[PDB]
């Protein structure tokens, strides 16, 4: 019985608390989207907007929890970009081996980092360890794959550049998300093995049923999403 616009007014404060905590660029994108919902003629149009908010806000909060930079989708580097700038001596070979699979060059993960525009991180192993720790401590489904030429050992007398590819998400089928993600990147990982490039792929996901202390985002951010974007989804259906 409530019009979509009136739904947005009742949730004015929860959504103000949301926009205040998200990173700037992320906060603006959700704000634009929110006014699209408020001015949404249809329930279909509103629903797609709400979904995009759910994903954008969650990723902003994932950036905050890990102190990583939130990158709007438009600015996110592709795999080819990372290879070209981070491993320039191998980019030509990278092209030849992606002739039969050129979509590899256009793979765009949520986070594309390298060891200290590809973002930088102080240690890739530390990031993998904390994912592996919480997965083991709380039972949270992850998938994780490292490139490895032949059966090469790690070495102590030299340092090599390396990539960390990360995929995140806020959807109800958590196992389905990490399974599909790792399957998408498997060919790439195997490609990187044959080029001698060291990469790690991580993938994880939360849904609203996950206990508020066990998410990949801080619990304070869990309450912000549950109080705003998830209530909005409930209002949109019951009206």
């Amino acid at each position, epitope marked *: 019985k409530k019009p979509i616009a009136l739904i947005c007014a009742e949730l004015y404060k929860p959504f103000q608390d949301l926009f205040a905590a998200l990173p700037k660029d992320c906060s603006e994108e959700c704000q634009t989207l929110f006014e699209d919902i408020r001015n949404s003629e249809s329930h279909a149009s509103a629903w797609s907007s709400a979904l995009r908010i759910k994903g954008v806000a969650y990723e902003g909060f994932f950036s905050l929890t890990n102190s990583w930079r939130y990158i709007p989708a438009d600015l996110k580097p592709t795999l080819g970009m990372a290879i070209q700038t981070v491993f320039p001596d191998k980019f030509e070979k990278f092209l030849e081996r992606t002739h039969l699979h050129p979509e590899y060059r256009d793979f765009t993960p949520d986070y594309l980092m390298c060891r200290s525009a590809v973002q930088e991180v102080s240690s890739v*192993s530390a990031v993998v*360890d904390r994912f592996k720790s919480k997965s083991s401590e709380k039972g949270r489904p992850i998938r994780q794959e490292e490139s490895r*030429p*032949k*059966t*090469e*050992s*790690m*070495q*102590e*007398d*030299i340092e*090599v550049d390396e990539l960390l590819i990360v995929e995140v998400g806020y959807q109800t089928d958590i196992e389905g998300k990490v399974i599909s993600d790792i399957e998408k990147w498997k060919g790439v990982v195997n490609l990187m093995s044959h080029l*001698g490039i060291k990469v790690n792929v991580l993938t994880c996901a939360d849904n609203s049923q996950t206990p508020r202390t066990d998410w990949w985002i801080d619990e304070k951010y869990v309450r912000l999403l549950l109080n705003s974007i998830s209530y909005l989804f409930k209002e949109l259906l019951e009206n």
Partner: antibody
Amino acid sequence: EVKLEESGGGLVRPGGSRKLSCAASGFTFSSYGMQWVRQAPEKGLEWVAYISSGSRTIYYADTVKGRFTISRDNPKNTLFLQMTSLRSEDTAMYYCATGYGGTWFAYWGQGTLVTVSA
Amino acid sequence: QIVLSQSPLSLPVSLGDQASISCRSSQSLLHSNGNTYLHWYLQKPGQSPKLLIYKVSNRFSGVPDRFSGSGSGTDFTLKISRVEAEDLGVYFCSQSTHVPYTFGGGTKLEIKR
């Protein structure tokens, strides 16, 4: 002077268990990977296990997998090898080694003799 | 696993002569990071092994300079330019490019008399 001093050897019954230790001195132990190597009497060298400085990476010979655990206590400058379900084929002199900067065996201990027999 | 084939199995040599020991790898030991992790060890009778040469041709600190190594890919050699009594023992090659790290079976250096 870099020194590695193994202890823990002796006689064990087949199927039994044993824990080797290696006390390291003369270098910053916690910054370097550590290794175990063994030599059966009258035979050649055989690599056993490696462990990185921070313990994140561990490798095993296929013949000890599922039976041997390598570990370390960096504040105590000690490397360990926990041996279980031992067989007569595990009878050997056991050496701890380190590359002090690489994965080669630059520094070796005097070794400790493990005998698996009833 | 990398199989390392050493020849000859045993090497009789006169004091003062040179000696060459060959180590053949079943696969290339060139690691993707650019280094080649092939090393040489002497084990004297009764003692623990001693490193001689690391990454193909670097003499370990303190090792007498009559010892040297060369090679690339799957073919590598240890030379003792002038053999001395103390060089009696077994020489092993080993790689650490791939897991498992592996050793050759050992060449016994024998002093000719």
